[PDB]
Amino acid sequence: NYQYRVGPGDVLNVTVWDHPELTTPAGQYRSSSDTGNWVQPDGTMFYPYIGKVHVVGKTLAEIRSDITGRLATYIADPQVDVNIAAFRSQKAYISGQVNKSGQQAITNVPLTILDAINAAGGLTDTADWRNVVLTHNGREERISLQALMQNGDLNQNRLLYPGDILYVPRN
Amino acid sequence: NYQYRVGPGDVLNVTVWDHPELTTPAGQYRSSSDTGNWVQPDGTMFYPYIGKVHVVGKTLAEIRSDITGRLATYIADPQVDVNIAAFRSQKAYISGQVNKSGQQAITNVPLTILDAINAAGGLTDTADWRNVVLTHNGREERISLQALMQNGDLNQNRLLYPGDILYVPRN
Amino acid sequence: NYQYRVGPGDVLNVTVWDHPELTTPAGQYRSSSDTGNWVQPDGTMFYPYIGKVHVVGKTLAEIRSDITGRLATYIADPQVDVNIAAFRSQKAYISGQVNKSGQQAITNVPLTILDAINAAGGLTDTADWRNVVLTHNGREERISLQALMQNGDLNQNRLLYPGDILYVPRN
Amino acid sequence: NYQYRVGPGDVLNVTVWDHPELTTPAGQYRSSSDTGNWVQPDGTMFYPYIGKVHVVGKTLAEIRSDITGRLATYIADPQVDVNIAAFRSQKAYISGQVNKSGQQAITNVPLTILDAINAAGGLTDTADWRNVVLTHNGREERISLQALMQNGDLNQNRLLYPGDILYVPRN
Amino acid sequence: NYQYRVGPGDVLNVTVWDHPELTTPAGQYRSSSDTGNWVQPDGTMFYPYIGKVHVVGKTLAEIRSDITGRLATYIADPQVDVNIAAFRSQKAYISGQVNKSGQQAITNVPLTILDAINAAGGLTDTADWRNVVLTHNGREERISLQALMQNGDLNQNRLLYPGDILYVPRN
Amino acid sequence: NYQYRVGPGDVLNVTVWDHPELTTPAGQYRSSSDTGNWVQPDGTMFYPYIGKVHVVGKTLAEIRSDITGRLATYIADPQVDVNIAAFRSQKAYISGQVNKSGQQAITNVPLTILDAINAAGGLTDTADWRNVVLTHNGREERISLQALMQNGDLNQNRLLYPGDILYVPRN
Amino acid sequence: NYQYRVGPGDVLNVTVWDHPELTTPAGQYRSSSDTGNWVQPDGTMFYPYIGKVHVVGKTLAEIRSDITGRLATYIADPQVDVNIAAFRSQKAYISGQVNKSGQQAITNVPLTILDAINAAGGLTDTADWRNVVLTHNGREERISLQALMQNGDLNQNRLLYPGDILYVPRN
Amino acid sequence: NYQYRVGPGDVLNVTVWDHPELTTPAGQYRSSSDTGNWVQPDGTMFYPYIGKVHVVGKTLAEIRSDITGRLATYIADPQVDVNIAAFRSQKAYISGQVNKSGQQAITNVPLTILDAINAAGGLTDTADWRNVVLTHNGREERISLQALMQNGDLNQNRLLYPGDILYVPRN
């Protein structure tokens, strides 16, 4: 049921089969992030011929439906897919007694507390890991990573959301 | 017995021989994971002409047969293969007294405890390596790596599955 | 509310669909910042056919509308988008007790204190992290990062602007 | 007499001279491992026109014979060779008092104990190197690397096989 | 009002839209610095058809005006822009108690004292940072970086010029 | 006197001038070892049109003459050269008190003790460098590197052969 | 006053506009130093059609005029420029108490003592930096770097020439 | 007067203007060392159409003369140059109290003792640098690097030759 939704600053990548002039307007060498479609602060992106596409708050399939229908005015029965070349809009903050603290992007793949620990290089040996602070939507909560690995208990793990702060205090 | 099954977030790579417009819509320079077909949360990926293809829970051979049969409506006798450009959906967590703790992808190649330990940069000197905790499907066991390398004992080794947690405690 | 506005020294990337002679005058291999359009000190960049375009103080959508309308004199119904290949004009300075002190670009994505700290390799152990100095428009405040990660407090966090200095003193 | 045999998960690379549409269906830039033919768990790979090719347990020349004959139905007198782009199926495990322990792939080139030491960064100074444990096919054996280099004696060296574990105990 | 002016040794990059034989005479792969126009010691560069172009002391727009007018003899209504591929002519020297001392190029983007600190890896902890020496045009001056970050005072910061030496003495 | 002879596992690179379909069947981007012709355990490599070519025990000039003569049946006066893209078959083992111990390939260029020591990152400070053990064809000698660098003595230096072990003991 | 003059071993890069067969005989991917024209010990380089060109002791503008005039016999009004892909012929030696001692190329850009010191990773803490030895044309001087960075003194700085040795002694 | 002469194992690079089928038989992407002409132990290389070219003992211009004349039988007035893509045949050995000891290739650029020190990372502080051993053609000699930099005396520096050993003893 986990569904990512595009936010401002994301870079989207639109594939139009049989139309490399649309899929790769700047050639095949540059990465999709360096050639993709920037989402503007008002939530729209420009796509050729169809104009502005409202994409903030929408899923990839919903954007796909939107773009495919409007491109049919200019392209015969267009075959289009949409994904994100750069997840720049949404992010969680993992700080404290993890090896490599910092921001972690919210993407189409779910980011749980456990998932976030690893991308942060893992806990340090002075981590108060039975006592981790999760701040979600102005609420606070205490999390125990010790029981997640010693007892395999998933009832302490949580899914991370845009803006969440995960703080591992020193001991 | 072991077979990988596609999950949401995986990036698939579809090769259609004699059809570079299908195999490489964005050109041939970018990597297959930067141009491949994302698997959506509903378990489908979009493919041109044939539309949405349900790939979650299916094997690569099954997806290939599915895509090949439906693509035959648009291409005469299509020659298709499918593999995975990015294993993003399923994963096991290796933590504790290994030199490189963290997240390890579940792929088409089997991943055993011995594979995961070796892939984690090896054990540390302070690893309780006769007493490793494996959490699988909400049920913990005790695993002894010592006997696996000193006594040739495979009967403590295990194949790892999605969601599994392998914890190597200190001593 | 937040919107980036182009400044002198920025390198812009203009995509004109169906016109690779405009999108990639130097070919498709070099990066967009190594081939993009420099913004001159008078606030203009040169664009072919239409000449000098005033871009400083304008948003990307406004520059796009400007270029599209003037390019229509030379191209029938031109499909144009503009983004930034290099954010060279505006910047905030993060110094003091962070692991990576220095210069951080102001871009189309908002940069908050929490973003800048996380982007600076994190605080150090000797950071006076309840007493961080923010200089904005010639007026200093006191900022407490401690409460932001221990108490969920966003009311001390701030969005950073061009010229801002964030100083994290020792303790 | 040493002969490698393909296993599941290997990635094979098929060269068909005069037919780049077969040799490089995804272009010339991506590596052969990222464009090659995956061996499925049932031991088969897909090859265009001829269908499924049973390759597990077979040598490269035997696969070459198989593919060449069947491609003759679709290609005039095909000139085909086959090699492995990725040795993913078979592996030996070298752990203990070697500098860089871990898995080493079994390939078409013989891997002896001495060959395996080097890819593992060599022995450490605390290696009980006169007393190395080799586990092969459920048998154990003691190996002396000291005599291999001090006395040049090859009667302690051994050829490593899929699944073998080579453990160098601390002293 | 800050304006860079080309000096000898700079490498310039001239873009002539619709004329890749002029923009990329050595192809699209090599960087603009490795294919650009060297400014000779007498202040001139060679450009095809028009001959020698006096560029030292001139701004980019002024060089653009010069080249565009003369190319009109050989190219219909040429659309030309000019930027610098390599800033090799002008430089400031930052030495002393900065982490990474050395030369910093003078470019089209203003380089202030504060800007120069960061590219030098920041100050060291033994920097006499309230007592920094700036040598500009044979004059000396004392600069306090402490007040720039503690009090946000820009009245100590300075713009750096070609040949300037910024020395941060040990304490 | 010294000449390399091809062994099983070597990857050969065959250049046929005016025939890029033969020289580069997989394109021109991939390296020659990633596209070259593998030498099989029976000592043959496959080459198009002419079939299997016996290359083990033969020199590059001999393989060239062999391939050229047989290729003349299919190509008028073929211009062919052969070299080695990967030296995988033959090798000497350098271990003990060198900064980089391990495996060193036997190639078309002679490899002497002095070459191998220098290629191994140099001796260590605790090397018994007047008493180095060379094992060649099942017969050990004593070698003094000290005299080679202090006394100009080449009469202790040796050319290394496949299977040779060079052991530098501690002191 | 300063002008570089070509020496033996330099690699020159000749651009002939509208003639990629001359500019890039080996294609456009390889670097200009890997494809450029070597200067032979007799002081000449070979150039197509016109044969050997004497380039040693001549400036780039002089070589350009020479090549352009002689190439006009084979090409109508040739547009030619020449620069240096590799500065291999002339060099100054920086040794002693600098963090990166060694060899520094003499190029078209002037190299002063202050340039060479900054390019050498900076002085060390034990450098006798008021007493640096410059050997030029067989005549040593004493140079004080201290006054150059503390007192704004350029009258101790020097331009370095081929063969010069700059020695920074300890203290 | 310093002249390099080709030896066995060198890789030569032959440029034939207007004939990319000769200059780049394997395409433009691979380096000249990976596509060049190997010199065989008998001193010859193969070049298309003309056959074997005796190159050992010859200079580049002499090889150029040889190849150019014989290619005229097959190519109208061929424009040919020759350089070395890989200096593999001749080498000097620098060991002892230099930072990075090892082999240094003898090339077309003269390698003096001073030149060899730098490529070796410079001397260590325990170098008996007033007492360096040079072994040249079975003769020994003592060299003082101290006087080369302290007194600028070139009468101790020497040109290094193939096979020379330069040993810097510990003190």
UniProtKB/TrEMBL annotation, chains A, B, C, D, E, F, G, H:
Positions of the Polysaccharide export protein N-terminal domain: 1-84
Residues of the SLBB domain: 90-168
Compartments (UniProt record): Cell outer membrane
The family this protein is said to belong to: Belongs to the BexD/CtrA/VexA family.
Protein name: Polysaccharide export protein
Part of the intact protein present: 82 to 252 of 379
